[PDB]
């Protein structure tokens, strides 16, 4: 019949191919779908939801409930940092197991802005002011409010609104960043400081906690699907 010629790649199996194959159950009567709440169309829809950050991965606090709480007190004012965090959303131990980190560990490249939200869980009789800072890479990581004050920052005044949001904008030399620890695509640094101290009246707890969440903005994207290191196996079934 028709003369044909076979080309390279014949009789191979590529797991990413897209071809038609015969149906093993012809004329099957398929059940129709109903309207169920909670349909998802993109995986980036799940990365735009805030999830709590396990800041305190101490040897005695990790793998417990105490790892999500950051302790504050009414001590005299100091310029030392409250927490320090490197912007590696997929490889930082404190960011890799959040929902954003879990989704990023299935991909190789990411880009976009982030937002960190902090919530204060003290008494209504407590007051204070804090400083949340982000520093692009290249210089020494900030260790004093004096240095952190030179990068991007927000001043959080604790009142009726008990939450603050800080947006980390996209400041990169490449169009995408790798989801591993890398010097050429490092992200920067994040820290929290006391602007003033925490002040309480008598008959009030002098120690409190804050909680933190991270999520993505509407200009965030990923690419190059891959496999994760967060699940493994030794025996079949």
């Amino acid at each position: 019949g028709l003369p044909v010629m076979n080309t390279p790649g014949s009789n191979q199996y590529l797991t990413a191919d897209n071809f038609q194959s015969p149906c093993a159950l012809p004329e099957f009567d398929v059940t129709p779908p109903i309207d169920i709440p909670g349909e998802v169309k993109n995986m980036m829809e799940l990365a735009e939801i805030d999830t709590m950050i396990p800041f305190d991965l101490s040897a005695t606090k990790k793998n417990t409930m105490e790892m999500y709480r950051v302790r504050l007190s009414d001590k005299p004012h100091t310029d030392d940092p409250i927490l320090c965090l490197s912007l590696s959303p997929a490889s930082d131990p404190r960011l890799s197991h959040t929902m954003l980190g879990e989704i990023l560990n299935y991909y190789t490249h990411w880009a976009g802005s982030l937002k960190f939200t902090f919530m204060f869980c003290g008494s209504m009789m407590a007051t204070g002011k804090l400083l949340v800072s982000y520093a692009p890479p290249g210089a020494d990581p900030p260790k004093k409010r004096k240095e952190a004050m030179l990068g991007t920052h927000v001043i959080w005044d604790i009142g009726l609104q008990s939450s603050c949001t800080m947006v980390v904008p996209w400041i990169s030399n490449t169009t995408y960043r790798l989801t591993i620890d890398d010097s050429f695509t490092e992200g920067g640094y994040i820290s929290v400081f006391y602007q003033t101290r925490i002040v309480v009246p008598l008959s009030t707890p002098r120690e409190m906690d804050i909680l933190g969440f991270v999520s993505a903005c509407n200009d965030f994207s990923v690419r190059l699907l891959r496999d994760t290191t967060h699940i493994e196996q030794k025996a079949l079934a």
């Binding site: 897209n18 071809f19 038609q20 194959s21 015969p22 149906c23 012809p26 099957f28 109903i34 309207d35 169920i36 709440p37 909670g38 799940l46 939801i49 805030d50 999830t51 709590m52 950050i53 396990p54 793998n63 417990t64 409930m65 999500y68 709480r69 197991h97 959040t98 929902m99 879990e102 919530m119 869980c121 003290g122 008494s123 209504m124 009789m125 008990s162 008959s203 009030t204 707890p205 120690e207 409190m208 906690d209 909680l211 969440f213």
Partner: protein, 286 residues
């Protein structure tokens, strides 16, 4: 007959089956039946997935006989027991519709029919003073499956231990495997920081939820529609929703070493309907 698209390229379907184809806010008042609720310190309310409860439509109804719609006789607020929040608490859980199995005519209709469906309104109440601190996370989970207490068998939890009723259960901070081979306990062992099902608690905010922060609000409200892979199902075999309450920040008061405050739950069925009337079911609940 060829389809031209852009990348242009051409595609043709060879088979007859598509499978073969290549691919203000602080104030709130609720009224149901003969019951009302008021709230003066609220953080608004949450409608799960943006869907309000509704009745089953003709274009999605499996059974053919006429359903029963009690309405005001069963769509009303029922108050469960009150739990005590202290500094040693790890959290509590409930199953729906399991927690309303002894609630007026709702339980009677539940145990007299073979199929039923319903949505819910959940209202959690907890108040303190301006000198208390703490935070609670309230989560609604569809298909809330918990892990057992056995490392020699799986899925061996008994029907009695998985359905506690309006009393509910509690989370624990440690996993203790049961070693009695002669008389296995056959009960859950839910760990708090794993949410009782092997997933990290920090991500539980993917589910519908709210937070009660003692310095901001004193109540939480969640509106849950009916969720399932079927249009209607058996309410006595299968639980649709689970409610989990966990302390996100421990309770603390002034300088006392043993503060305590109560937490109360009120739940209202919504748009509930039933099918398949017969003699009443008499389960073995002990």
């Amino acid at each position: 007959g060829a389809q031209v698209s852009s990348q242009n390229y051409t595609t043709i379907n060879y088979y007859r089956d598509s499978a073969s184809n290549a691919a203000s806010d602080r104030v709130l008042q609720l009224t149901l039946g003969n019951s009302t609720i008021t709230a003066q310190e609220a953080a608004n309310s949450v409608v799960a997935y943006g869907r309000w409860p509704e009745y089953l439509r003709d274009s999605e109804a499996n059974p053919v006989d006429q359903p029963t719609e009690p309405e005001v006789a069963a769509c009303r607020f029922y108050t469960l027991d009150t739990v005590s929040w202290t500094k040693e608490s790890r959290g509590w859980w409930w199953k729906l519709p399991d927690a309303l199995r002894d609630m007026g005519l709702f339980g009677q209709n539940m145990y007299y029919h073979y199929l039923g469906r319903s949505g819910y309104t959940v209202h959690v109440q907890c108040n303190a003073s301006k000198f208390h601190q703490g935070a609670l996370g309230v989560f609604a989970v569809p298909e809330m499956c918990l892990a057992g207490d056995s490392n020699t068998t799986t899925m061996h939890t008994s029907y009695q231990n998985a359905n506690p009723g309006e009393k509910g259960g509690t989370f624990t901070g440690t996993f203790t495997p049961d070693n009695n081979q002669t008389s296995p306990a056959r009960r859950f062992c839910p760990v708090d920081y794993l949410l009782g099902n092997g997933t990290l608690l920090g991500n539980a905010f993917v589910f519908p939820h709210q937070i009660i922060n003692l310095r901001t609000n004193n109540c939480a409200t969640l509106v849950l529609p009916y969720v399932n892979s079927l249009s209607i199902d058996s309410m006595v075999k299968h639980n649709n929703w689970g409610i989990a309450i966990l302390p996100l920040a421990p309770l603390n008061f002034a300088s006392e070493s043993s503060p305590e405050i109560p937490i109360t739950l009120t739940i209202a069925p919504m748009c509930c309907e039933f099918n398949g009337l017969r003699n009443i079911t008499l389960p073995r609940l002990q």
